[PDB]
Symmetry: C4
Subunit: 180 residues, 4 copies
Amino acid sequence: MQQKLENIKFVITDVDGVLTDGQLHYDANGEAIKSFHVRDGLGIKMLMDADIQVAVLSGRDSPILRRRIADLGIKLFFLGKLEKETACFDLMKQAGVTAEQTAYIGDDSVDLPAFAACGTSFAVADAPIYVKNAVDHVLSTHGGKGAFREMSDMILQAQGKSSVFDTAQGFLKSVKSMGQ
Amino acid sequence: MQQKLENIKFVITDVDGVLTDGQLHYDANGEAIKSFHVRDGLGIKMLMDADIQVAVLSGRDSPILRRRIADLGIKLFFLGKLEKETACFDLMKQAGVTAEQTAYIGDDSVDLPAFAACGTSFAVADAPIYVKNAVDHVLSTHGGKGAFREMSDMILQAQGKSSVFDTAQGFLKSVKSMGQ
Amino acid sequence: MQQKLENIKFVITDVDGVLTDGQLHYDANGEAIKSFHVRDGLGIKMLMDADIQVAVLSGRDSPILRRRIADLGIKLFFLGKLEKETACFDLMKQAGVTAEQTAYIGDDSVDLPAFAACGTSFAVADAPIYVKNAVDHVLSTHGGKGAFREMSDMILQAQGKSSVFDTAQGFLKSVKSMGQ
Amino acid sequence: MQQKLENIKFVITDVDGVLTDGQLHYDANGEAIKSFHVRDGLGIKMLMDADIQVAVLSGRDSPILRRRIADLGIKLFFLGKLEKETACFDLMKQAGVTAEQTAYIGDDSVDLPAFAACGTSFAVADAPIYVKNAVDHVLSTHGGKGAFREMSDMILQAQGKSSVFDTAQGFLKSVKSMGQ
């Protein structure tokens, strides 16, 4: 992992089930609320702040997801498309990174093809076994409970940038880039 | 039970307690939010995509639920039904199948007569003791945490159709009917 | 407990913390959502159906709660008052029962007075120890996860009325009265 | 802690991850819902009632949070502030107390500088190990599950004021200052 982690320059995360606990909160009008986790966002920022682009590939789309994407300043992303293989390379071309430079975090079958495309994949804790068996690393955290952060934390760990989340001083350093 | 699982051409699921964790999110106007798990949605489609029909039979009726049912493309169902036996038999007839080819996943006492009516019956992990004792298989996933997907996975697996969720290759092939 | 239980004719429950997980869902305007558990609802209906009245006591009054109280068909209740002692006596006089015939289920310091006024008291699994200390029976289910159902099943069982919930036929006989 | 606890005359609490479980429930417009635990709510009031001021320092700012704040009667706070060191000192000045007289409860990296600035610091149970390593005391309750209340009880206890949450009498005596 140390191997591939240090080489990551681009992170692609699914949304529902990863940045989310997979719950689709409906009201009479369809998707009404989507729950993201505050620690994941800080992690997204810490990555970006540490020269590591972050994009979301979601087999779904909603103004809610878009808003969250905008709050976080994510620039690269693909929504509504359930085929993830070509979508990743398309994100990779856009980021000027190779497969070997992009990590991916998923939770379901829909992500099986993105794990094949990115070379460095993550599975959230509550992911089913066929997904766990198809990734490089299984997270201890459940989707939506900080799984992404667990990943960002370890990517920034291996690349010697942990000080940003490790300590009061390292954090106050990148303080002007932690918002969401 | 692989036998039962292989005969299943029809699944009837309860809503509150199975497709959700049993929480009813009230507004001053009654249910204002119903949470559904994306991974359960995917599983419902895969069953459908696999020639296995799906029906909903809730003890409660809400437009929120009716919207979720429509999103999933489920045509057979009954809502607000606390008497589930008759409901189960009607649904079977509508699906053109026998009690022998249909499964039912429930969580509480209301589901007891549905159990008796359906060939195969499942209970979510958090179901009371008297519901667990009356089904063929108690699932390990709690209501609302993807217990339906745990079941649909068993069903497809047992009918040699797991490649749909087992792998990149298989999932892609049915990428056409994997929506929510 | 078996003796106290078979004598119960009246149940008074707190709300936030018992019928809910103590979570208060805020939007910019205060409580925006109250989550109640379905199996608790069936519990309340099963209790009333077995000639055991159910009242609700909460320090918080909100149209959301009132809506729930109405769906359940709960007749006696005191809202907005954090001084539960007199409230308990008033409800008991209204219910026409003695303190020895009434059960109270709580979760916080606020409920201590209630425990003392009511013959029988229950605490939800996640109540703090100084609450579990003050009651007759500490339940094993968390507040809002069906602790109330745990208690009602317990009262119904103790009264030779567990049938409505442990048998399809028992349930089907009291079905016209299970609507929440 | 004992010595620390007895001198606490001011508690500063983070919001996301402490008063809540870190989930950010998004609308197409940003945070749509914020869930706060009722017992944390009461713990805040018991603190104030015992002449211990309570302040809030949060990385995010929202009208939902401000509403909770006003309901709890909190006057000192700084929102949207990711730099918490200065803020803690400023709040300390506002409360007329010293770093020694002030406790802080947090859950993530952003809180690191807050822990260092306050005499006594707490971490919620689900905080990252790198946050736990940095606090005076790690609570056993997860953020949003009543971790603030667990701390408030410790403080009051240490000061010989547990009677408010300890007994019916102590509660009633202060019952007029328990609303949230």
